[PDB]
Amino acid sequence: MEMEKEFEQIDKSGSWAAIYQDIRHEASDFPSRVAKLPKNKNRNRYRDVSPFDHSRIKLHQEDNDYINASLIKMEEAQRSYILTQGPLPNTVGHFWEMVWEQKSRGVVMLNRVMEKGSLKCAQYWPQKEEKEMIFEDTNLKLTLISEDIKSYYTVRQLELENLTTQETREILHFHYTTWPDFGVPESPASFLNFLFKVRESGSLSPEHGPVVVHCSAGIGRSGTFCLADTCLLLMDKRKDPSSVDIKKVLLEMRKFRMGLIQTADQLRFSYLAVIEGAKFIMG
Ligand SMILES: O=S(=O)(NCc1cccs1)c1ccccc1
DSSP states (O other): OOHHHHHHHHHHHTOHHHHHHHHHHHSOOOOOTTTTSGGGGGGOSOTTOOOOGGGEEEOSOSSOOEEEEEEEEETTTTEEEEEEOOOOTTTHHHHHHHHHHTTBOEEEEOSOSEETTEEOSOOOSOSSTTSOEEETTTTEEEEEEEEEEOSSEEEEEEEEEETTTTEEEEEEEEEEOOOOSSSOOSOSHHHHHHHHHHHHTTTTSTTSBOEEEESSSSSSHHHHHHHHHHHHHHHHHSSOGGGOOHHHHHHHHTTTSTTOSOSHHHHHHHHHHHHHHHHHHHO
């Protein structure tokens, strides 16, 4: 079926939970043996969210190459993304090592450091220009260059220096600051505006490594971001945009990381975002 009318048909019939459970039943199951080794317990935020072995990002280290991060490679859309958990106190150095080694331009953050009164990820970037951060375990230095605070999101320019070689690179930090503590946003308008700002920066484009996107577990809000982006790109590429099937795209992405889209409300919000976004692209 088309999307917008499949949408109203699920709303009128109140069957979002049944649609979402079908997706969960059909989703791929691949091994995640490296994630479960005992030496990696303090590298995982949640015991039930792990990268598959076949698609995990490897650190360029011979001691321990593990990070909770996955490469999502979308062949027809010609886009790639790295989805990862919010960094932990003992993985902030690994996080920036990955950004460096994978040649990423942008980092997309969809959570606040504290939500619901608890810490959802480490304070992994500097908050003042004159107070830079040094990660001694991976030999990197990170400096805040500039910060632009808007009503729904903040954009930061950061400098990452590889202290071994003295090479430097500019990284863009795109921080969506207004996702509600419970549920999903009422309108997708500010989320779409944010997505378009990431696109306009070059961070999603083939001349760079894959964008790094995270929330707390790296599957829920993060899944919504890449699912909406890929679906809108396919609608631009194909002769028949109404052939784009959001459930099929989601199942394809779940071949690369488990659990993408965590609730039926997140699934409904993803439909809403693609539907509204497709009108703005044209008119
Ligand atoms: O016809 S669509 O599948 N896509 C239209 C587009 C053409 C080019 C980019 S987007 C559609 C329309 C409205 C709501 C959902 C889906």
